[PDB]
Amino acid sequence: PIREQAENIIHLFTLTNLGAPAAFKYFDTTIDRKRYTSTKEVLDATLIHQSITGLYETRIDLSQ
DNA sequence: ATGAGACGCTGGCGATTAGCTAATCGCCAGCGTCTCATCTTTATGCGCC
Prior knowledge:
Elements: H1 2-11, E1 24-25, E2 30-31, E3 46-50, E4 57-61
Antiparallel strand pairs: 1-2, 3-4
The chain binds one DNA strand of 49 nucleotides through residues 20-24, 33, 35.
Protein backbone atom coordinates (compact mmCIF):
# COMPACT_ATOMS: atom_id res chain seq x y z
CA PRO A 1 0.00 0.00 0.00
CA ILE A 2 0.83 3.63 -0.74
CA ARG A 3 0.93 4.80 2.90
CA GLU A 4 3.52 2.23 4.03
CA GLN A 5 5.69 2.90 0.98
CA ALA A 6 5.46 6.62 1.82
CA GLU A 7 6.52 5.97 5.43
CA ASN A 8 9.45 3.90 4.25
CA ILE A 9 10.42 6.44 1.60
CA ILE A 10 10.45 8.84 4.56
CA HIS A 11 12.65 6.26 6.33
CA LEU A 12 15.12 6.38 3.47
CA PHE A 13 15.87 10.11 3.92
CA THR A 14 18.24 9.55 6.87
CA LEU A 15 20.78 8.28 4.33
CA THR A 16 20.70 11.73 2.73
CA ASN A 17 20.71 13.56 6.04
CA LEU A 18 23.49 15.99 6.87
CA GLY A 19 26.23 14.69 9.12
CA ALA A 20 27.25 11.30 10.49
CA PRO A 21 25.96 8.21 8.68
CA ALA A 22 23.70 6.02 10.77
CA ALA A 23 21.85 2.81 10.08
CA PHE A 24 18.11 2.56 9.35
CA LYS A 25 15.59 0.20 7.74
CA TYR A 26 13.25 0.21 4.76
CA PHE A 27 10.88 -2.66 5.58
CA ASP A 28 12.89 -5.55 6.94
CA THR A 29 16.00 -4.59 4.96
CA THR A 30 18.43 -3.25 7.55
CA ILE A 31 20.30 -0.45 5.79
CA ASP A 32 23.60 0.00 7.63
CA ARG A 33 25.78 3.10 7.71
CA LYS A 34 28.37 3.92 5.06
CA ARG A 35 31.44 5.01 6.97
CA TYR A 36 34.32 6.72 5.17
CA THR A 37 37.28 4.76 6.48
CA SER A 38 39.92 6.62 4.43
CA THR A 39 40.74 10.34 4.60
CA LYS A 40 43.24 10.50 1.73
CA GLU A 41 40.95 12.32 -0.72
CA VAL A 42 40.50 15.31 1.62
CA LEU A 43 44.23 16.21 1.30
CA ASP A 44 43.70 17.59 -2.23
CA ALA A 45 40.14 18.84 -1.79
CA THR A 46 39.00 22.42 -1.10
CA LEU A 47 39.42 23.71 2.45
CA ILE A 48 36.48 25.87 3.44
CA HIS A 49 37.48 28.14 6.30
CA GLN A 50 34.15 29.23 7.64
CA SER A 51 32.16 32.08 9.28
CA ILE A 52 27.86 31.79 11.54
CA THR A 53 25.33 32.31 8.69
CA GLY A 54 27.33 30.67 5.86
CA LEU A 55 27.31 33.88 3.84
CA TYR A 56 31.04 34.74 4.07
CA GLU A 57 32.72 31.78 2.41
CA THR A 58 36.53 31.63 2.32
CA ARG A 59 37.80 28.80 0.12
CA ILE A 60 41.29 27.24 0.10
CA ASP A 61 42.51 24.93 -2.68
CA LEU A 62 44.52 22.30 -0.77
CA SER A 63 47.39 22.12 -3.25
CA GLN A 64 50.48 23.36 -1.40
C1' DA B 1 -19.37 24.62 20.07
C1' DT B 2 -11.24 20.59 20.00
C1' DG B 3 -7.88 17.89 20.05
C1' DA B 4 -1.83 18.56 16.91
C1' DG B 5 2.42 20.31 17.91
C1' DA B 6 8.32 18.14 20.64
C1' DC B 7 11.55 11.21 16.85
C1' DG B 8 18.57 6.29 17.88
C1' DC B 9 26.27 4.87 19.80
C1' DT B 10 29.25 6.14 16.90
C1' DG B 11 33.70 6.18 16.52
C1' DG B 12 37.30 3.67 17.29
C1' DC B 13 39.10 -0.22 17.44
C1' DG B 14 40.12 -5.19 15.52
C1' DA B 15 39.62 -8.06 12.21
C1' DT B 16 38.25 -9.58 8.54
C1' DT B 17 38.02 -9.60 3.48
C1' DA B 18 40.24 -8.05 -0.75
C1' DG B 19 43.89 -7.23 -3.95
C1' DC B 20 48.30 -5.33 -6.52
C1' DT B 21 52.61 -3.22 -8.95
C1' DA B 22 57.19 -2.86 -8.65
C1' DA B 23 62.49 -3.39 -8.18
C1' DT B 24 66.56 -6.92 -9.31
C1' DC B 25 68.57 -9.77 -11.77
C1' DG B 26 69.47 -13.34 -14.93
C1' DC B 27 69.00 -15.60 -19.59
C1' DC B 28 69.20 -15.70 -23.65
C1' DA B 29 68.40 -14.98 -27.99
C1' DG B 30 67.53 -20.16 -35.47
C1' DC B 31 71.39 -21.58 -37.97
C1' DG B 32 74.14 -25.03 -41.31
C1' DT B 33 75.94 -25.48 -46.06
C1' DC B 34 76.68 -25.54 -51.33
C1' DT B 35 75.97 -24.45 -56.42
C1' DC B 36 75.37 -21.06 -60.22
C1' DA B 37 75.95 -16.73 -62.50
C1' DT B 38 75.95 -11.44 -61.97
C1' DC B 39 78.00 -6.87 -61.56
C1' DT B 40 80.76 -3.32 -59.11
C1' DT B 41 84.88 -1.26 -56.17
C1' DT B 42 89.64 -0.98 -54.08
C1' DA B 43 95.95 -1.51 -53.59
C1' DT B 44 99.86 -1.04 -57.26
C1' DG B 45 101.53 -0.21 -62.07
C1' DC B 46 100.71 4.86 -67.94
C1' DG B 47 99.22 10.09 -70.40
C1' DC B 48 99.09 17.85 -70.18
C1' DC B 49 95.27 20.59 -71.99
